[model samples]
Target chain A: DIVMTQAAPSVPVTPGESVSISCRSSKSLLHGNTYLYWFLQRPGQSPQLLDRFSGSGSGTAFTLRISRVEAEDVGVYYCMQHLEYPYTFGGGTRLEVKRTVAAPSVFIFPPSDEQLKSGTASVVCLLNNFYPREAKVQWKVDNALQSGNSQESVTEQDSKDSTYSLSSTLTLSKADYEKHKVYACEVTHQGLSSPVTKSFNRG
Target chain B: DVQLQESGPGLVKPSQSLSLTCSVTDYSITSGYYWNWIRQFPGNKLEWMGYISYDGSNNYNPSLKNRISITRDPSKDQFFLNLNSVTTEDTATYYCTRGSLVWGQGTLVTVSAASTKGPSVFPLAPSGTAALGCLVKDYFPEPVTVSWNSGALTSGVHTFPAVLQSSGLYSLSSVVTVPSSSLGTQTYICNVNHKPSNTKVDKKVEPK
Candidate 1:
């Protein structure tokens, strides 16, 4: 039987950072021509084997490096030695990523020109190019927070840029437009010291 | 007999990408069975990143759908996982599995991110009657709390247990039945709290 031991119990990283994890085996993993392997497990997901490796090992220690870290890389990692019967795995190392601060760009899409005259209108608060992926949008009328009959919020990822976008919509009736002169959308994110607010006047 | 092996980096940098290869022996990747990339984190958390079928059809976790790609190299009898934009949160033991039965030894990849993004809330039901629901998605660190508020007026709010999505994130839906008398006059608020990031999001809706 072979024993696989992970050097660290946990490693913490920041966005756009890099890290390396190491594993050692009690016996030579290459004694009989077998190689070492690496696997990862995230919270609520099953373990997945990475499809890369070093040449056959001649020694007892093996290393792997993630050149860059993103929010999705957060999880626990393990090392396995596959030279003999009954494969062995190292105690898992938890990978934690420090949340980076990236403020959101806020834009308010007021009711359409056609809807403004219909006595009922809907506005959308668009929060784009944000990091940490999480944010909230609040609506207010005349400086007082108001609730809409319906609210919708969606978060989308930009694969090319690795950022997140969110859009929240608030619906209002003619009575709301008459009662308040100013309508505002407040956007809050972990990266912002204060909520970003965008407003529009009732036309 | 079939065997799978996983190889990849043990450490990754934030904003960088990680590449992994899965080699198979005694069985051809194009012969049968779907090759899958799965992972586990501390606390027994598991995520199914995606899979590559023998015919080359690919399916991925929606959360990771944009960042992960699985491909095959028939010349080498191997498959691959190319993950981009890795963070500390991407640290984990990655494994290649023949479906869910046989598995390759896992490799650890650690990036450094302390916390992940919080949750987003969307109201699913229209205002009017007493029946209304809110769907919460894309929250990390597990174990989130969803509560309802109606301006000091208490009503029965039913919160479903958080469901773990394939991307390793948690999602939940909550339903509430307001009093008919309070319909048009009352505003309901859904408060989602994720303690790890110390973040809270609130969304409000009024009866139609």
Candidate 2:
């Protein structure tokens, strides 16, 4: 049995920055002199290979790098060695990126300011170019969390982008709409301690 | 040279269970090792299917949660994966791997879209800092990529294998640096390109 260890339990990256991760093996992974491999994990999803050893081994170390980081790169990452059977992985580091919440559509569709009757006002929050589909979105009223009917959808944003986008809708009563002092869209995906929320007011 | 093969039924009906098997050839499963099962779907991405030990121990990907079950048959040195309530999203290539991470040849399986789960977007990180990283969790056999903007990157991004808790999940991380003078709260992107090309996305945050 072999053990793998990664440097820096956790690290921070700003948008347009660069980052690197190191994978080290306890024992020589070279089988009859072979190379090692690397992998990556984005919160709540499966692990994916980052690189592989074409020809290197035995107490060897490999590094994976990403230059000019983006906000979507936030989450935990790990590396594994395929040189040995039952390939082993290393501990991960968490990447936390501050989310930029787009101004709520409600701002563009004010209620009381528009002199509206009673019916229903619905707005959908779209998080384009993101990952790990387990994130949840909720609505809030006057700084209080409010539960509303919601549905989620996920899809590939683009091949060049290699990311995903998710959207969720919240339906509420017009009365509740009147008190839209703190309407928010909050999301909690993998590797996050708290949810990222954006608030809106009827200005 | 010994080769391994993955054989599982493709096209599982919606609301039905999906099953597949990975067989090893020219190699012995009893060689004091573990056998793994991973999958990928069409125009989607790869998922950490599951794995089995030579001793018959099993671990499933948490994302798959209760929807998946894996077992090993020491007698035949073979492993199996049983996915429940499979939808079109569940349709993918199923592979049997001798080891867990790299060098695993995958067998592609296709499932219909009736029982698939909708895509989701999670937070990765913030802006205005340097050195961002994330964990891939329990994924295996799939490939991942990271992209950068603001001028161009020299070395690009890198990922290294790491450890997990007793729960059997795995972790990975990446890092990069930018000129402090150039740091003015910008947007960086890190995306995963899994087989079947399913996109898994996240972002990172930095302090000014």
Candidates in order have lDDT scores of 0.68, 0.51
For residues A1-203, write the lDDT of model 2, one tens digit per residue.
46778777767555566766666888766656544555555543445555222223346676667676675565556666556444556666555443333221111112221123435444445454444434667766676776546445454222233344554545566676666666667776654556677555644
lDDT of 1 by residue, B1-208 (tens): 8888876655566898988889999999998898988776654445668889989989886768889999999879999998999877787778888865678877666564434668766654332234455666667655456777733533444455565555566666565656657766767788877654567878775432
lDDT of model 2, residue A53 = 21
Give residue B32's error in model 2 in angstroms.
22
Off by over 4 Å in 2: A7-10, A15-17, A30-35, A41-48, A51-62, A67-77, A91-123, A126-203, B1-18, B21-36, B39-208
Off by over 4 Å in 1: A9-18, A32-34, A41-46, A51-58, A68-76, A94-100, A104-190, A196-203, B1-42, B45-208
Highest lDDT against the true fold, candidate? 1
Alpha-carbon RMSD, each predicted model: 17.8, 14.8
